[PDB]
User: Which sequence fits this backbone?
């Protein structure tokens, strides 16, 4: 087959493809359909992912036994804005994980990593805002400002405007950060133009009573970008003098990259909180299709997410490092970011003050936003005392104090012991 | 939780008759140590109120790995600007966080129902194949097959060769579309290529005396870029701007990209490209949603035409082209919501197209695949004319072989594909 010959070259060296700065590389788990040879199916994938039948994509590496295929994409395949000469993720996705996901000769193919060379990477927006901007608002250090105590209000959807605002007020007496639940917006039982003014008033009340600054992440997701812009402007107008303290929450997996670029390019001076609801449909290890969480979370930095949800890391630090450092390793590719702004990890899926010190030891820092369910609403006293116990668990860790010794001086952290007694170490 | 988020005593028919519930039907298998109704209820919670508007498991078939949930309509998000529905909300509630739950091995959406009060809040299509029939001078009802292509190779042609292949195709064919990644690549910049494509279309119109149709890729991250591309393309097509379709890569760019086209360019056929959809809609996937559910959703968003491929998935065709249709689980009335046109990738030669038509009941479709066009021994033009002839012959119900004499392009298809119907 001349298709196999034209669209593969196993003699190309990865090192030299990287050195040329002329190629986007992607690594995939691929398995052919029974009867198709690995190299023929791979070359066919490279063809379907580029020219069809020199801007041809090339299979440069196969491991038939490991079900591993590696493809070099000449940079000039990728689409460029007519308005500003910048890159679009939509083009990266359509070539490298587009048509190639419907091919009859392939049982499955999943992107595990990619490499973007400097001349292409620098054409992406990258983030304009991150946790540094939140540290600045809170009056914490601009380097290693540490842990931001956040929550979702429970119940997650269904609270009328007034009970929502009252629960937010109660939380902000102790915690830093509240996010809308990702579906939360302008539902008939809690309209946006009723709820948002009461949340802004709740935030001011908690600020007046504590003398501390607070943070809110408002859902602006919609289909119509005019509606995302209307939501964004209404929220900033409503928060008024506190408008700088509002993050914009975007469901960028189900709404897609265009919704995310809408927030990034219309509201660059606001923290862009990327919510990934629905991502598991492809990123689950149970799926052999689409792309991994690692690939997803790396692309969100390119889009300019200020913070990205990354989960619990086993309670996965490699994903955090790839978004928060200038120089990082994927499972297959080393990536230099050339000072593209970090995206902040936002951790979720429970976690309580007793297990926080081990989470920080593994990560090597606590420069993260935590939207903790169990950790705050499981505290015996109050969700506010729960958020204080979480910050105190960070402060204890940063000091290197002994948690139990630390508890003697810190009632909220002490009462965490009595809150989670079967977590609490003998 | 299980008690709160499930009620198996609820009757599907009364949920539909209330007009107060969106219903979703899913293939669901719990993790090994988890009971089926416990997992389903937990899924309903994660898909609604977590903890009036609690979503409810109303039906499980543990043996069939099947779970049906009722979603009170008031859960769904509404635009502040125009009081209209947004698909982003239906996706985040019905196939959102529920796709990352540790106590579920897999859950895939197989069908959904929208009651009339909520359905009518969606844009629906504003344009479909009827608008193309009008342009082509063909009947407004059952105007038949539109003969289409993608220029080969897929990507890589310079502007002048791309425009030349478009001119050559249009001498026999009706419709050309960008390949889905084709836009403003450096080797074929949009502002060089589109003017030459428009020129090629005018030359083909002048020599044939027939109208032609082009589908221009306007996909981008930035909605401002989608609008600049769409404006540049209408400006350049000038007097032929009515004959331009806007192609959006709606799966990889998402519903916000499609609404951008739908709401800024409602007067232009919105051609929905689904590159990457296979990552979830493949029968090999147990996650996300089926091609049926995907294609159903595109009609809501207002796709004028939707790629559906090429027997029983004409269950799909009926759901996008009719006012009244049945999914695998739910009957849906569209109450006059404009139909979405199937765009097929049907390779089939002029001699095999008939069996496709036979199975469909009609040839009211746009065809973009190349097998019957580029496989023709003479020219891609001749191949397009052969496929039209194969619709026209099948429509008139003439004898293929008797029709072949008097129709040289269909004739030469017999010599082009000596195997088949023999």
Assistant:
């Amino acid at each position: 087959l001349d298709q196999t010959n034209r669209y593969s070259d196993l003699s190309l060296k990865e090192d030299e493809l990287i050195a040329s700065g002329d190629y986007v590389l992607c690594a995939y788990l691929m398995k052919p359909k029974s009867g198709y040879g690995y190299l023929e199916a791979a070359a066919h994938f490279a063809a379907e992912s580029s020219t069809g039948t020199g801007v041809d994509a090339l299979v440069y590496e196969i491991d038939e036994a490991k079900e591993l295929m590696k493809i070099a994409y000449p940079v000039d395949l990728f689409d460029i804005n007519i308005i500003d000469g910048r890159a679009m993720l939509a083009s990266f996705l359509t070539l490298t994980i587009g048509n190639n996901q419907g091919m009859g000769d392939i049982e499955y193919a999943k992107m595990l990593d990619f490499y973007m060379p400097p001349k292409y990477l620098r054409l992406y927006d990258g983030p304009a805002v991150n946790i540094q901007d939140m540290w600045r608002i809170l009056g914490r250090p601009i380097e290693n400002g540490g842990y931001i105590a956040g929550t979702i209000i429970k119940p997650k959807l269904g609270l009328r405007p007034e009970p929502f605002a009252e629960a937010a007020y109660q939380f902000w007496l102790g915690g830093d950060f509240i996010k809308n639940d990702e579906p939360q917006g302008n539902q008939p039982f809690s309209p946006m133009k009723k709820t948002i003014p009461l949340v802004a008033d709740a935030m001011r009340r908690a600020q007046d009573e504590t003398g501390e600054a607070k943070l809110f992440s408002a859902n602006i997701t919609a289909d119509d970008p005019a509606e995302m812009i209307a939501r964004g402007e209404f929220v900033l107008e409503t928060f008024g003098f506190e408008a700088s303290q509002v993050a914009f929450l975007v469901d960028g997996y189900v709404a897609g990259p265009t919704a995310v670029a809408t927030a990034r390019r219309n509201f660059p001076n606001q923290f862009l909180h990327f919510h990934r609801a629905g991502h598991g449909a492809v990123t689950s290890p149970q799926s052999k299709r689409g792309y991994t969480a690692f690939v997803h979370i790396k692309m969100t930095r390119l889009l300019g997410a200020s913070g990205m949800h990354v989960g619990t890391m086993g309670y996965d630090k490699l994903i955090a490092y790839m978004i928060e450092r200038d120089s990082a390793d994927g499972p297959f590719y080393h990536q230099e970011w050339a000072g593209m702004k970090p995206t902040t990890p936002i951790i979720s899926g429970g976690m309580n003050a007793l297990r926080l010190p081990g989470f920080f030891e593994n990560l090597g820092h606590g420069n993260v936003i935590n939207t903790a369910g169990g950790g705050t609403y499981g505290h015996i006293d109050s969700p506010a005392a729960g958020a204080v116990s979480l910050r105190q668990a960070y402060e204890c860790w940063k000091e290197g104090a002994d948690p139990v010794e630390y508890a003697k001086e810190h009632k909220e952290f002490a009462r965490a012991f009595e809150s989670f007694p079967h977590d609490a170490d003998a």
